[PDB]
Amino acid sequence: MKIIMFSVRDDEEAAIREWEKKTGVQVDINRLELDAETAQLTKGYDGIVIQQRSHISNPAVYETLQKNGLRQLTSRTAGYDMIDLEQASERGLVVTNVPAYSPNSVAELALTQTMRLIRNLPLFDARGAEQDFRWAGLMAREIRSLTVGIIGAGRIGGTVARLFKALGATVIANDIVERVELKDIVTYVSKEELLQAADVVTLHVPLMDSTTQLIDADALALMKNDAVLINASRGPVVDTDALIAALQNKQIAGAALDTLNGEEHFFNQDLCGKELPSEQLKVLRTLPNVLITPHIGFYTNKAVQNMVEISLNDVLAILKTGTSEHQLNKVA
């Protein structure tokens, strides 16, 4: 038995071949995408796994698969928006995703980013660019003496607290629901209390109408002038404009942004001396106190492995059983 995998990265390769071993299933990789040309490559295969943003329209695809008799179309990413569920449905194609990869990936990036700001490192690095090596006024703090606010103590949000609690810090959290598992880890508080008490605020909530622009300028108002803002979740959870405003005015210390508003038109593109599409991107990259990362929180050996492992196991289940825990569709 064998699976074909598309659009495979060089960093995914280690993880696939570990799973090839484990299950004794043979998997074949290529660097293509799925289009009606390349669908013909499914010929000798019992199933397929893809990765891409490209919306796949042409019914010749779902036909061709069904014609070589694949019973599913699997995506290793969280998003399915490029697969047409109806089209899969009528072709006897069950389509699955991989929503949850290791919550540690993002977490340790929240940690790294935070520590840097805590040590005042971007300012050292600035001074030291010009060979001012003086340390005047840059005295920093120890984590045990910090109180870390977490909004959305989640799968991730929860992992984050656990990290910091372990480092010796003091962890408070704002959440609409309390987990008992976090009982010795966070003290639960209202958003208004957290913002007031917290040296570091880190946003782990999902992006909903509920949470969109949860950080509004009166929430930034509420924060300590020397406190920092860490957003690893989703760009729109934050008011990009109020952020900038607060920063300039020194309402808060600085920030780490892994995700920004309007990033679909910048992160993961070669902008090298093209022009920047976001006036905010342009204004934030000119702020000294602010770090930015291309929504790479996820991107780690163990996280890539999950997407590789899970997405493949979903392929097996559909084949042996006919059902996967991750399936988004029906057939007839």
Place this chain on the structure above:
Amino acid sequence: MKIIMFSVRDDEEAAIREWEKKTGVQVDINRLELDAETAQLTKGYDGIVIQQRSHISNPAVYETLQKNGLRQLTSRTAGYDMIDLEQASERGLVVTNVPAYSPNSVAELALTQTMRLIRNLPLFDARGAEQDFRWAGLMAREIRSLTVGIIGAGRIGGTVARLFKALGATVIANDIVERVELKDIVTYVSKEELLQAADVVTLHVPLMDSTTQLIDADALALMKNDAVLINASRGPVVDTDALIAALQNKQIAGAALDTLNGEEHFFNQDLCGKELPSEQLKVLRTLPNVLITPHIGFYTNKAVQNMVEISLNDVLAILKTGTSEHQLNKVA
């Protein structure tokens, strides 16, 4: 009682005054370093404490300090290097320092700078200045998925391990004496086992005829090619030409330096516009994967206040007691 304090900084003032308040002992300050007419500066004062690099061999201070009634000379840093041993014990002058201030200051810097590197942040940042927002090739690693080598698991060395331990790292150490307190937290290995097994290699030893060039041409060629080195201890510890040759030739992946060869002559000075003393420093600033900080490991609220409290309670001891912990010398 009253005590004169020297070379004081803005960061120290708040921590000092709190002590004055606490003990009712009056400490008068100044940004002066102790040299010559600074002798009588001790006039009304019953004790003196200093923070400086500049050495003092001249007896026209010591007799003054004897006559002015000062029974001691106390340093607020761990360094005693600038003090005379003959003149001290004979002039009526005891000499105490602070051997250890908060160990988490230094530990947490190496944890930060390590985490930064594990996450490929310098390469990401480098790309983001080009406005190249692509993440392809930058995959990072989880802490659990790493083996952290500690050379010198001492006060600081051992704090580092507990940390990386808590965050789930497999942690191995190298020391000439093994603490039982670390039996559970670490696995003791030899230097050559360590350099070969570990992804992160962090140095905690003191500068000694023994440790000087512990990381040498050979030690570096032993390390994983994907590994990183973190030197938070002392410049001489690493053979800096070898380190450069090794980053240059990609023998290791990156490095993080809080101390460098001959730092006394560059670190903590505004060299903006001036030429750099070490070609060693010149060259290291152009290597991508390398991170340099001006010996800011110690520098945090707790560690500063530690220095101040301790040193003054070393003085009030040698007055209200006649003896103190960290003193080394005899009498007339």
